[PDB]
Amino acid sequence: SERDQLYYESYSDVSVHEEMIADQVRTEAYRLGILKNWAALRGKTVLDVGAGTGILSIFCAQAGARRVYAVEASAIWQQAREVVRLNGLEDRVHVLPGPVETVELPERVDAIVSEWMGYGLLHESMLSSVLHARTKWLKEGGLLLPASAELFVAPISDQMLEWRLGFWSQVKQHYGVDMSCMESFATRCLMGHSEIVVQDLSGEDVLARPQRFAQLELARAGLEQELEAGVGGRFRCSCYGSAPLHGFAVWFQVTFPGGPLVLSTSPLHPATHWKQALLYLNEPVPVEQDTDISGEITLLPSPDNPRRLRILLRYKVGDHEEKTKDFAME
Amino acid sequence: TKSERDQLYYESYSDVSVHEEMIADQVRTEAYRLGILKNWAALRGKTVLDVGAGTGILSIFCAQAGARRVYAVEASAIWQQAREVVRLNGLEDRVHVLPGPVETVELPERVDAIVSEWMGYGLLHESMLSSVLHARTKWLKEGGLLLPASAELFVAPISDQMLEWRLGFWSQVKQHYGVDMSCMESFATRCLMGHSEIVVQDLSGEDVLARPQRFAQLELARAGLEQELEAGVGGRFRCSCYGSAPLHGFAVWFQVTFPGGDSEKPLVLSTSPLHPATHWKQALLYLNEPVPVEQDTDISGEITLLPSPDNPRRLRILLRYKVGDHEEKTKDFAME
Ligand SMILES: COC(=O)c1cc(O)c2cc(NC(=O)NCCCCNC(=N)NCC[C@H]3O[C@@H](n4cnc5c(N)ncnc54)[C@H](O)[C@@H]3O)ccc2c1
Ligand SMILES: COC(=O)c1cc(O)c2cc(NC(=O)NCCCCNC(=N)NCC[C@H]3O[C@@H](n4cnc5c(N)ncnc54)[C@H](O)[C@@H]3O)ccc2c1
């Protein structure tokens, strides 16, 4: 309650809603994903879980929803009421303040729309709120937007990290002072920790074919029990070539029903504010073409904080013995 | 507490990231390189104290400039890496890395010169200045050399184009997505401008609304400078706007100046938005809301850099200001 209240009012500031709507890959994907469901939303009722400024609710109205209930727990709900009023939709889009867990809707709804994903998919873990509203207020077999999330893992050779490690071998060319001996210290500092690092990679950093290691269907009942215990699964892949293996990037996509539109955070797709979630090994591990990497990745809430993402990594490079690493978000 | 702050600072400077930023800062590292090498005559065969040596790169520049002995004093765990950096370049006979605070180090001798890179954001936030002044009094010989010799503080009124774009962003949602969100503008201004925090951000010359005014100078060689630091480094200013724009507030930045010696022309390391970027960026002091001004609009007031009452290392800035015919206003800022 102390946490929930502190977590909600982190969204009472403009900067995080600005960043979300300024992410055009995200916002266009949601806009299209909603509008493309015009046939299934037309004449139907909708619950926007965590409506924020209310922009997703208004796309739902544009898709022909007859009513949208925009439920928002933080102070930003006042802005959304004015946005709705300003767009002339106060008769069809109803901003209700409070947590979706305890708000009273006038009715069960035909559809849920929500943008609930955090870093590494489940950090902040608003997903439990969405699934709570599904059970309580979505009608049987009702539409969820997006409908599902897919998790991906790929082994990586991070060019940024390389450049930072090799920075110390370059100081001589720049200023006449040799500093190559700092490299191992830079390695321990940048890789030896146990934090999930949130950073933008590109296709150049991907060391093998991405593997989908879990799918979460939002419409599947009892998925709330699974989240507390951890979701994820196993993977196996083979390296493209020779490079220092730095670890793994984890990312996700969300899929809207076809009416199929996919919002991807892959480093092979245009960048989003989510970037990717990097799991560095303690030190770089040389690999070559067809090196076999297998393992298991599990996304869990942290013991100390149920909204903080933790990731249990088990891996095995070639024949170098199975290792594990325990990661938590900063 | 102080033990909380000191442990957070040990841990920070014991980590590679902050040193990578300072050395990657080519404007800074190169100025110090030229500023030191330019003073070879003063430094040839003399002794040097490097206050806060970090990785030792400044102590090595000193040895490269002809110094016979350099004491490279560094309080964080990074002293161990600097010891290896000195050994790698074959300098451990001339450069001695000593761990710990400069306040408690014991040198074998007093020194001919002090070099230090001690400047925080807005010059004095997190400042190692008091460490440098303490080493000056205790270890520098009479008439010894200080590198850099001085710092100067500058203020300018600003129309921050990036801030403008964030303020107008909500007015541009409809053209992009069909949803009118221009009612958000007032709310965004309150968030982005209504706080009392100093914001550290890069600006360009396009942001500077009037001639930058130097309002203070710090001459490191002056004994009893220490008393001015606790009461306030500050000064008064007046300027006239270049043209029409919304006035968002003021930018504060600094330069430091190395003595000429061989060339007599003084090398300046600048953090002005008119000069190449550095990691110090600028300290922005936003008004509660934009104020429209035009060509030759008068702007005047007083700026005082102070320590915060709760934390002496945390920079506080008192801004008193007057825009044209508006009434004088004040706003009290602290670093986040
Ligand atoms: C100086 O600053 C820095 O340096 C900084 C550092 C960062 O690390 C920064 C990180 C950022 N990124 C970030 O924060 N999030 C990116 C993904 C987030 C995941 N959440 C999500 N999808 N958003 C929509 C959620 C909306 O639903 C509401 N809601 C929640 N539960 C509810 C419930 N039960 N009932 C009703 N309403 C509920 C919320 O109130 C909100 O309106 C941004 C800025 C950052 C800045
Ligand atoms: C037993 O020791 C502990 O447990 C300890 C105790 C402290 O109280 C600590 C206090 C710190 N605070 C601090 O650095 N604030 C500055 C922030 C902006 C300005 N920085 C800048 N422009 N360049 C930094 C250049 C290098 O100067 C070193 N240094 C700093 N002050 C020093 C001193 N008195 N003597 C010797 N070396 C000192 C740093 O470590 C750094 O590498 C850090 C670490 C500390 C460690």
Numbering used by the authors:
A (entry chain B): 44 to 302, 307 to 377
B (entry chain A): 42 to 377
From the paper:
Protein arginine methyltransferases (PRMTs) are important therapeutic targets, playing a crucial role in the regulation of many cellular processes and being linked to many diseases. Then, another series of compounds (12a–12h) were designed and synthesized, introducing also an adenosine moiety and exploring the distance between the three groups. We also report crystal structures with various PRMTs supporting the observed specificity and selectivity. On the contrary, we were able to cocrystallize the compounds in the complex with both PRMT4 and PRMT6.
Structure determinations and refinements revealed that only compounds 12a, 12c, and 12f are visible in the active site of each monomer of the PRMT6 dimer. In all the structures of the complexes with PRMT6, the electron density for the compound is always better in one monomer. Compound 12a is the only one for which a complete electron density is visible in one monomer of the PRMT6 structure, whereas for 12c and 12f the electron density becomes fragmented after the guanidine group and the density for the methyl-4-hydroxy-2-naphthoate moiety is weak. Moreover, for compound 12f, the active site of one monomer is occupied by both the compound and SAH. The crystal structure revealed an unusual distorted U-shaped conformation adopted by compound 12a (and probably also 12c and 12f) in the binding to PRMT6, with a folding at the level of the guanidine group. Whereas the adenosine moiety lies into its canonic binding pocket, the guanidine group of the compounds is unable to reach the PRMT6 double-E loop clamp because the linker with the sugar is too short, even for the longer compound 12f. Instead of binding in the arginine substrate pocket as observed with PRMT4, the methyl-4 hydroxy-2-naphthoate moiety is sandwiched between the adenosine and the side chains of Y50 and Y51 residues of the α helix motif I. Hence, the binding of compounds 12a, 12c, and 12f affects the proper folding of the PRMT6 alpha-X helix containing the motif I (Y50-Y51-X-X-Y54).
